[PDB]
């Protein structure tokens, strides 16, 4: 199938309360596998998945060193951004960066990513060509000019096409028990009277991995798209996800409604009905 690796980074400044807090996490698909918190007792990059625990002492020393270097660079970059936006030193500010790669079923690079945000909005992003930049504003243009001069895109391209993909494939093999196992949703439909005239039908999907799922309601085979309430897919805490989809139905017409469930772990797509 298709897989992804992402490293996420967040620095938050806190004037008068010491240096910025730095938190970075790594993901393969929907699985958190590493974390680093600058405020931790003695900051180390730590395993968060069982398949990464087999990487040796040298892996963890290097990762930890990279995180420490990144935290410090982020401290400098936060100070730079105050300058670029003519901001006082009074306020708390946020610097975010994500990078990583998508691979197809064959293990070849589909897309590389590297992008930054400041105070929640796009700052600069590496384009899909892994050679050109999109700067959101005139401040980001200063970074763009600096990064063009220092040929940073080339350095990122080399990693994204090379190590990112290679290590992703390695992780997928080492974690094949879980990363290459799709767990199907456990599904059921519940009924919730509103009045003598109508009721809510709620279609549940529980215990699924990965997070990608489609839940839809139909009436007589016609999709009830506008009339469906859909909660955001939410984590169960045990690597699995949950979602439900609800429709308001006229009492007595429940059997006209079908909930449809599409997920990779299922032998076949499901068609569910309210079953009293």
């Amino acid at each position: 199938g298709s897989h992804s690796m992402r490293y996420f980074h967040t620095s938050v400044s806190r004037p008068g309360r010491g240096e910025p807090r730095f938190i970075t996490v790594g993901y393969v698909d929907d699985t958190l596998f590493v974390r680093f918190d600058s405020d931790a007792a003695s900051p180390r990059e730590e395993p968060r998945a069982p398949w990464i625990e087999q990487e040796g002492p040298e892996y963890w020393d290097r990762e930890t060193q990279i995180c420490k270097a990144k935290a410090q660079t982020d401290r400098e970059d936060l100070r730079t951004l105050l300058r670029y936006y003519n901001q006082s030193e009074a306020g708390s500010h946020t610097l975010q960066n994500m990078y990583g790669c998508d691979v197809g079923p064959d293990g070849r690079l589909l897309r590389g990513y590297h992008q930054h945000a400041y105070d929640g909005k796009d700052y600069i992003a590496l384009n899909e060509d892994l050679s050109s930049w999109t700067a959101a504003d005139t401040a980001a243009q200063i970074t763009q000019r600096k990064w063009e001069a220092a040929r940073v895109a080339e350095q990122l391209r080399a990693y994204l096409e090379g190590e990112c993909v290679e290590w992703l494939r390695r992780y997928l093999e080492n974690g094949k028990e879980t990363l290459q196992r799709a767990d199907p949703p456990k599904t059921h439909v519940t009924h919730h009277p509103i009045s003598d005239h109508e009721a809510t039908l709620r279609c549940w999907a529980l215990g699924f991995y990965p997070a990608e799922i489609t839940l839809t309601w139909q009436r007589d085979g016609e999709d009830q798209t506008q009339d469906t309430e859909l909660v955001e897919t939410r984590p169960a805490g045990d690597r699995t996800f949950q979602k439900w989809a609800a429709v308001v139905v006229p009492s007595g017409e429940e059997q006209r409604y079908t909930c449809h469930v599409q997920h990779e772990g299922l032998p076949k797509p499901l068609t569910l009905r309210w079953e009293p």
Binding site: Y7, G26, E63, T73, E76, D77, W147, E163
Partner: peptide
Amino acid sequence: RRKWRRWHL
């Protein structure tokens, strides 16, 4: 594993 960052904003 991670990329080493060698550039600043």
